[PDB]
């Protein structure tokens, strides 16, 4: 039992839980080395 | 752009036109030289004069 808004929030939170693309490490001024990753057990969503 | 230029040519000269065809400067700007006959007569009878001193 979910609402549409909760489900959309969950979908957005799911689409953000991926590693960075590797080619971004090759850019000219890149300071990132890895991804704000979230684990369902380690950290809980704001609900 | 073509549709809106045609619409602006259409509504030109009309007193009332759609809001999007009305100028949008700022709510405050969208919200002067009239003088009363008294002030006009005062200005006519007593205008500011051009003068110099010590001559």
């Amino acid at each position: 039992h979910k609402t549409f808004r909760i489900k959309r929030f969950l979908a957005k939170k799911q689409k953000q839980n991926r590693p960075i693309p590797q080619w971004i490490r090759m850019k000219t001024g890149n300071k990132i080395r890895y991804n704000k990753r979230r684990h369902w057990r380690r950290t809980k969503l704001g609900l | 752009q073509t549709q809106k230029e045609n619409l602006r040519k259409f509504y030109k000269g009309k007193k009332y036109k759609p809001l999007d065809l009305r100028p949008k400067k700022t709510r405050a700007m969208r919200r002067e030289n009239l003088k009363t006959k008294k002030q006009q007569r005062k200005e006519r009878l007593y205008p500011l004069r051009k003068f110099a001193v010590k001559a």
Partner: protein
């Protein structure tokens, strides 16, 4: 049993997401106070997109001109 045992009975949410401020602010006016300047600066004009005020600044720098275009080639 007021500690660990009581923490296991946590099933019903007091709060949910707000439709105005998005936090988990029905009064027409916004909730803000002078005794929390940190809270005031966490949400103020400039912490968002300003998707209308920046254009206002750009248009002010030119006198709010409209109905004109740069001279065609």
């Amino acid at each position: 049993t007021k500690g660990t045992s009581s923490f296991g009975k946590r099933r019903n949410k007091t709060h949910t997401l707000c439709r105005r401020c998005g936090s988990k602010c029905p009064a027409k006016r916004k909730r803000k106070y002078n005794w929390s300047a940190k809270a005031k600066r966490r949400n103020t004009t400039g912490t968002g997109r300003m998707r209308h005020l920046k254009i206002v600044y750009r248009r002010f720098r030119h006198g709010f001109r409209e109905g004109t275009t740069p001279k065609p080639k």
